[PDB]
């Protein structure tokens, strides 16, 4: 189960991934420099963007949210309920379940048997050295190249200043001697057309990395320590964890901003075995690359299922024209 989704979306009036201005009143959004051809030599441009650590963090959050409702939601870390980003720290030689059970950090097979979040998103305990590569890989959210080269300016930062007004119990503004915690707190806001290529690899969930495949008599089989029903539960939860991504549940300051979210277009490939990575939507010309890659993969003999939204993706290629994001998850999960 190696699923790849990539496409273009629009984000407006959002303060997601704010750099904070180095801890002062003026808080500003993180920026990244990208190279664009402009048909006269590649030139760099500074544009705000959202890093993939954010994406992986709220992927973990969505996985926890959609896994706690399942009957097998007991197997979760106590810190996962409160949405703790970290998995293991420097001095923790033991872990605590939601119910309070104590867990060692040896023989990672039992760790992934009894922890589910660490199985899907990876973990690392420096004291014990037990490692696990995250089964989900996050791509950076950059604005599309054509949009950037089409504006030739318009830095997309508004720098809206919004302060805090407080008075004492008598109703006095006060001065610096009394403090009154009166600051300026200016924050800059972004808008534009971005692209995403979040990809998920569910082919190794519930199987330890030490011995992924077991042999009984010269025959390979997956080494699943957990009961298979828990494996389907975890796979379904991971697949549906992307629901609070294409709706506006991404980035920081979700309380006051709540970015205006919609999907301009998207392309998904599900398949069953290993497949080439779906190219990013940042480039203006990813569509013909996508159709060429899927056509050649089908030619090689890859049983890939292709779904499209707001993309023609040719006519010869058998692609299912999806209707929304959640029913796309339904399409992914009927074949489990």
């Amino acid at each position: 189960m190696y699923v790849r989704i990539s496409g273009r979306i629009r984000l407006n009036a959002h303060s997601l991934n704010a750099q904070g201005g180095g801890g002062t009143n003026y808080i500003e959004i993180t920026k990244t420099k990208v190279t664009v051809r402009t048909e006269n030599g590649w030139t760099v441009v500074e544009v705000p963007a959202i890093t993939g650590n954010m994406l992986k963090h709220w992927h973990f959050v969505g996985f926890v949210d959609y896994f706690k409702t399942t009957p097998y939601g007991v197997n979760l870390t106590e810190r996962a309920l409160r949405y703790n980003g970290t998995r293991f720290g420097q001095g923790e030689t033991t872990a605590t379940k939601a119910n309070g059970a104590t867990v060692q950090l040896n023989d990672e097979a039992t760790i992934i048997k009894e922890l589910a979040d660490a199985d899907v998103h990876g973990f690392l305990a420096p004291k014990t050295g037990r490692r696990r590569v995250s089964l989900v890989k996050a791509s950076f959210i950059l604005p599309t190249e054509d949009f950037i080269k089409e504006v030739e300016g318009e830095r997309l930062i508004t720098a809206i200043k919004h302060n805090r007004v407080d008075v004492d119990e008598k109703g006095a503004i006060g001065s610096s001697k009394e403090g009154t915690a009166q600051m300026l707190f200016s924050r800059e806001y972004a808008t534009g057309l971005y692209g995403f290529s979040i990809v998920l690899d569910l082919g190794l969930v519930g199987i330890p990395q030490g011995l992924p495949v077991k042999f009984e008599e010269n025959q390979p089989r997956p080494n699943i320590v957990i009961d298979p029903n828990e494996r389907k539960a975890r796979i379904e939860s991971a697949l549906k964890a992307l629901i609070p991504m294409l709706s506006g549940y991404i980035g920081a300051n979700l309380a006051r901003s709540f970015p205006v979210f919609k999907v301009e277009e998207l392309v998904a490939i599900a398949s069953e075995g290993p497949i080439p990575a779906l190219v990013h939507g940042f480039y203006e010309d990813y569509i013909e690359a996508n159709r060429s890659i899927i056509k050649n993969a089908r030619a090689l003999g890859f049983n890939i299922e292709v779904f499209t939204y707001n993309v023609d993706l040719g006519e010869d290629i058998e692609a299912t024209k999806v209707s929304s994001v959640e029913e796309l998850v339904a399409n992914l999960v009927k074949m489990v």
């Binding site: 201005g21 002062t24 003026y26 001065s175 610096s176 009166q182 300026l184």
Partner: protein, 107 residues
């Protein structure tokens, strides 16, 4: 000479006390690449002078010395004679030379 006054003004913009902090204008002035960016940054910095004048008596601090029109009219031709950014960049940091000085703004 010819730089102390503008730097003292820009230090009056942001310093101890005088609770009106705007680092965007000075940051844009420092990173300005072309003459238009420098001019717009200077205009934005000078736009806040009435606020500083009003806040001068709000805390008992001495009023800030408003930069003379001679300085800006001299900058008008001191910036508009160059052809490459390499020669103006240090001008910008010279403009920022006094951004975080230990000035006795309110002794």
């Amino acid at each position: 000479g010819w730089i102390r006054n503008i730097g003292r003004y820009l230090s009056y913009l942001v310093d101890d006390t005088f609770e009106e902090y705007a680092y965007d204008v000075v940051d844009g002035i420092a990173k300005a690449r072309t003459q238009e960016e420098l001019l717009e940054g200077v205009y934005k910095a000078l736009r806040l002078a009435p606020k500083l004048k009003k806040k001068a008596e709000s805390k008992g601090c001495p009023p800030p010395r408003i930069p003379s029109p001679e300085d800006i009219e001299a900058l008008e031709e001191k910036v508009e004679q160059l052809s490459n950014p390499k020669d103006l960049r240090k001008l910008a940091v010279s403009l920022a030379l006094w951004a975080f000085a230990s000035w006795n703004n309110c002794p």
